[PDB]
Amino acid sequence: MNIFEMLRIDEGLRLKIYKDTEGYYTIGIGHLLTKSPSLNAAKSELDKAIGRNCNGVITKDEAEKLFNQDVDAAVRGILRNAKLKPVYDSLDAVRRCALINMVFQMGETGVAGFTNSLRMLQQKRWDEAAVNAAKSRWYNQTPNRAKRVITTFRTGTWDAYK
């Protein structure tokens, strides 16, 4: 396991424009296209990210490419974020994957708001960090996924994903 296999499980793969759990237009492996309700807006953005007239469908490769760029960005955002970098850096490898997953899902700003769990993760207070993070709208909205990510922070193993 690694970040790619992990997110590929949590986000799935779809080659046609679909709506995410929030109702937004997305494609491939969790690649958000727009928060706009217009499918036209969705299609334009897609043609732009792909660089061709897709007609709302891409190939697997195109999806894979977008995903690579998306992880890269997520990591780089972490690294650039003064509240995030320190946590990330104090973490072992499995746990970092959990941190990238959340950033991938809710953006750095979203993650950066878990002030208290972040501090607890930094102190290696796993159980505590896990109980704090479950008190979130993130957890109540996508409970299955949140549980797998939280267990990963708690145990530092991939069990939740086997």
For residue 78, the partner it binds in ligand XE, Cl ion, none, with Cβ less than 5 to 8 A by kind, is none
Is the CB of 54 or the CB of 118 nearer to ligand XE? 118
For residue 17, the partner it binds in ligand XE, Cl ion, none, with Cβ less than 5 to 8 A by kind, is none
* Tokens 């949590």 -> residue: 10
Half-sphere exposure of 84 (CA within 13 A, CB side): 22
Q: What is the DSSP letter of 57?
A: B
Is the CB of 15 or the CB of 106 nearer to ligand XE? 106
Please indicate whether residue 20 is annotated as part of the active site: yes
- Please report, as ranges, the residues that interact with ligand XE according to CB under 6 A: 111, 114, 117-118, 121, 129-130, 133, 150, 153
- 117 annotated as a binding-site residue: yes
Concatenated DSSP letters for 73-131?
HHHHHHHH-TTTHHHHHHS-HHHHHHHHHHHHHHHHHHHHT-HHHHHHHHTT-HHHHHH
For residue 144, the partner it binds in Cl ion, ligand XE, none, with Cβ less than 5 to 8 A by kind, is Cl ion
Residues noted as catalytic: 11, 20
